[PDB]
Write a protein that binds this DNA or RNA. Sequence first.
DNA 1: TTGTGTTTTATTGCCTCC
DNA 2: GGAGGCAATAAAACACAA
Length: 70
Amino acid sequence: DKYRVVYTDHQRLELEKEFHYSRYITIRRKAELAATLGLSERQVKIWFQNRRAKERKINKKKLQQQQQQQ
DNA sequence: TTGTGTTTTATTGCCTCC
DNA sequence: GGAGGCAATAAAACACAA
């Protein structure tokens, strides 16, 4: 049935932290993180892709706001 | 509630690396 | 010799007003 799982607040936290460590995850790290977090490598891949899109989207907006002063 | 918007998983399909 | 990137999209989930 399921169309999307919801990730636990723990799982998200680790992933955000790691994302701050580096925007692109290494093959080795990916494998560590998946194993310690109880998700698949694919899910971690994908999550990292989404987070970079979110970041691009937030950055464009930061820019749009900064164009809007003086 | 219901409608209305934004966020979060997950896929698809195309591109680029020698 | 196939991984890894992005964009565009879908739908569940949330948030919350009216």
